Ligand SMILES: NC[C@H]1O[C@H](O[C@H]2[C@H](O)[C@@H](O[C@H]3O[C@H](CO)[C@@H](O)[C@H](N)[C@H]3O)[C@H](N)C[C@@H]2N)[C@H](O)[C@@H](O)[C@@H]1O
């Protein structure tokens with residue numbers, strides 16, 4: 001029998017979600033199982049669990065980000081440059097590969113959306129505007145990004161059937177780690193600026209692996225290895241949400257652990 005909102009809310013409370021919390025979810029809907037009214041049921045449950053003073057932050061990205069098409073070029077290739085749609089935060093769909101729940105989150109009434117087309121973040125709650133801006137090219141997941149503010153805002157990472165590789169916030173640890181050999185990428189995104197499409201080319205840390213040994217396409221990347229180690233070494237509330245094994249992680253703690261983990265393994 002499909003899970004009801006009420007059942008999910010009680011499960012979230014059992015896991016340690018409290019009214020007022022700042023939560024970043026990572027969800028496998030297949031692990032959760034059928035929901036009374038589909039994925040919206042879990043969105044509604046998350047919003048009810050954090051309450052009217054709580055906040056939700058999600059990494060939603062963009063279905064049509066021209067990342068691969070512009071990667072490694074000093075400018076968007078001509079055919080891309082001419083016809084790609086500008087990123088419109090009000091209308092651009094979420095990237096399906098990071099979770100089907102994210103399109104439900106970003107279309108929720110009052111949801112705010114960050115301006116970085118590839119790293120785009122969606123937030124619901126009284127602090128949503130403060131969370132989502134600024135979000136500039138060159139600051140995808142590190143200092144000055146929504147993740148940086150989430151980490152200063154008592155953020156909790158709510159992993160609902162998701163693996164250790166899913167913990168986006170650990171890209172912050174990669175950005176700030178004082179280690180040699182860090183990989184960077186260059187790409188171009190089409191932004192809206194006063195109603196006009198403007199191509200912006202930037203470099204940033206490689207979010208597919210901060211060092212060569214973490215950058216195999218299949219992984220494991222550093223995020224995965226850090227989070228696996230962390231979860232083997234830390235008390236973290238665990239329990240079901242729907243049918244999914246779930247965990248509620250203190251974001252500042254896991255990111256601090258990850259900075260230390262990288263700096264202990266790689267020379268400065
Ligand atoms: N490296 C191993 C990891 O790879 C993916 O996760 C990474 C995405 O690939 C990145 O996405 C970027 O690169 C994609 C592929 O080029 C583009 O499509 C996309 N627009 C870009 O934002 C994202 N920023 C960080 C995320 N950790 C898998 O999901 C994850 O399970 C696995 O551990």
Ligand SMILES: [Mg+2]
Nearest residue numbers: 053054126127
């Ligand atoms: Mg508040």
